[PDB]
């Protein structure tokens, strides 16, 4: 790894400059060599994990989604042939998106998960898991995809039996997670009124529990319930 | 994009 | 050169699809291929170039400003020693950003340049010399710095005697390079006096030719002499 | 950053 010569908290100070540089791609590899010393990941450090890769990807995505959307048009009826560019350069992008997704499953599988003991620690890794499969599955179409699909479900549920347990229903963990998962519902399973159930029940039993929480703990909560509320509207 | 986090 | 076994046209479609995906460093890459298949280049070959290489040094160059900036306020007095870090992920992406400069002068001199022999290609061409220069001015300190600062100067002011001769005074060509070139005046050579009145002429002169244009020329050329007055407006 | 193109 390019990053083994650099000391672990080197690394954590340069992901957090990359991040106020906007350089997510270097953020992203500085948080890579942290993971790869091998110690376990604090929750800040989870976090700079977790922006990094989803910045990272997030452009990659929309860049794929934008390449999708041309290849589909030059494929309809009528349309001039231009060739196989749109296709190479879509599958170029892909095959990106790909190696990022691997990159980020490979420090979850070596060795993140198996030595996350503690409910925030675990449940976080076992979503970043069910996100970059969610990811892989939103450009498979080959034979292995049904059971993209599945490593993803799975992941997610594997989370949420772990954090229905052991978190209250306003962690922010647990919402997220639950946010995501209902969206793998809509987008990926294609099954609209499970991502709606997930989302109101999760957004129902998070409200209950708010007049446990001290006003910063209230601001993380709301934040993420105004994002399943968000979806909800956009699905209703 | 529905939001995810 | 990676893009060595790509056609032309395949480049220059990819560099479009590039643009459209925001992906301005793989268009820079393709733009890149295209220029070395050794034929010269179209207007609007030029533009994706110069859009493409443009958004790739101006996003290093505001990670430059504010990793350079967190550098500054961690070398005063009171501040705390944070180590090496702050300064060597600044040279990382100052490194990566004169890489970049270097590998567009590089395409520039070998061979775009010379082979430049119409006005429109020649001036555009210079301009961007020019530019790349002062880009590599904005983070130097060696012994070079004011050679550097002298080769901006001098493609800058080759480039405004052909305008001066072979184009109209609305040519946006000829105000692109006037607005950069005060710009430099005002940045880089501490020449505040000699960029107002760099602006100010252009603008002037400018305006007393509108009148010749059609209303899609008169588009273009108001839009760059906005930004003049812009900067006119920054700095009195 | 002043305008430049
Ligand atoms: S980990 C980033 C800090 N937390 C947050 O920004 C937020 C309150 C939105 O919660 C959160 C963020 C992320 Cl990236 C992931 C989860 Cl599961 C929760
Ligand atoms: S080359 C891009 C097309 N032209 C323009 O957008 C504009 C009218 C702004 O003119 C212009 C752009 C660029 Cl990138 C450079 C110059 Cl010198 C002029
Ligand atoms: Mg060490
Ligand atoms: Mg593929
Ligand atoms: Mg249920
Ligand atoms: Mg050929
Ligand atoms: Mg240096
Ligand atoms: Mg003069």
């Given at each position: 790894g390019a990053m083994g010569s650099m000391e672990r908290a080197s690394l954590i100070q340069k992901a957090k400059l990359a991040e106020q540089a906007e350089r997510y791609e270097d953020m992203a590899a500085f948080m890579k060599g942290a993971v790869e010393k091998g110690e376990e990941l604090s929750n800040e450090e989870r976090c700079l994990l977790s922006v990094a890769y989803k910045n990272v990807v997030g452009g990659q995505r929309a860049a794929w989604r934008v390449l999708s959307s041309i290849e589909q048009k030059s494929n309809?009826?009528?349309?001039?042939?231009?060739?196989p560019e749109v296709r190479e350069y879509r599958e170029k992008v892909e095959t990106e998106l790909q190696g990022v997704c691997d990159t980020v499953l490979g420090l979850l599988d070596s060795h993140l998960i198996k030595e996350a003991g503690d409910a925030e620690s675990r449940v976080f890794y076992l979503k970043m898991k069910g996100d970059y499969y969610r990811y892989l599955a939103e450009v498979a179409t080959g034979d292995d995809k049904k059971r993209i699909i599945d490593s993803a479900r799975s992941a997610y549920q594997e989370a949420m039996d772990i954090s229905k347990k052991e978190?209250?229903?306003?962690?922010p963990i647990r919402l997220g997670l639950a946010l995501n998962f209902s969206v793998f519902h809509y987008?990926?399973?294609?099954s609209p009124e499970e991502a709606i159930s997930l989302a109101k029940t999760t957004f129902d039993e998070a409200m209950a529990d708010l007049h446990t929480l001290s006003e910063d703990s209230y601001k993380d909560s709301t934040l993420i319930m105004q994002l399943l509320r968000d979806n909800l509207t956009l699905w209703t | 994009f529905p939001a995810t986090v």
């Open positions: 309809e009826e009528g349309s001039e042939e231009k060739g978190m209250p229903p306003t962690n987008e990926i399973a294609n | -």
